[PDB]
């Protein structure tokens, strides 16, 4: 269930509400300002990392479950999304349907959205691909 949630359901949840559109109209306080803007942010693919931990001083190192248990840390992995930004502009005049066009300003784009805790021996944990003697090397029970 955790492998299904990480590998497939995370992507579906991101792609459900990926598009987010804010609309600004002409602000017809003067005749020079008749431009309508449309800003759309779209969340693309989601990437889940290996488990890690950031320290007080910003130092991030890969976290292993024995070290996580001893230091009272959280065995979690960061989640990134490829966000794409789109800005559209149009001439806002009455009696004409608005036609928005791209301004060719599309920056791309992993951004941190949160630490998802990782169930041990999932498809994401370190102990999954560990062999036997490797697993005693990490001070874990086989």
């Amino acid at each position: 269930s955790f492998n299904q949630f990480v590998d497939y359901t995370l992507q579906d949840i991101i792609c459900e509400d990926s598009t987010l559109i804010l609309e600004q109209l002409a602000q017809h306080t003067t005749e020079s300002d008749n431009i309508s803007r449309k800003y759309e942010i779209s969340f693309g693919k989601i990437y889940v990392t290996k488990p890690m931990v950031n320290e007080s001083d910003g130092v991030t190192h890969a976290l292993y479950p024995q070290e996580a248990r001893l230091r009272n840390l959280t065995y979690s992995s960061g989640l990134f999304v490829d966000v794409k930004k789109r800005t559209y502009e149009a001439i806002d005049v009455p009696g004409r349907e608005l036609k928005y066009e791209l301004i060719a300003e599309e920056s791309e784009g992993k951004v941190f959205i949160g630490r998802l805790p990782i169930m041990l021996r999932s498809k994401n944990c370190y102990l999954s691909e560990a062999t036997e003697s490797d697993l005693y090397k990490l001070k874990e029970c086989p």
Binding site: I21, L22, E23, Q24, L25, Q27, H28, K38
Partner: peptide, 9 residues
């Protein structure tokens, strides 16, 4: 008297 920002579903 306008609404400035608005939500587009």
């Amino acid at each position: 008297l306008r609404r400035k920002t608005r939500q587009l579903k």
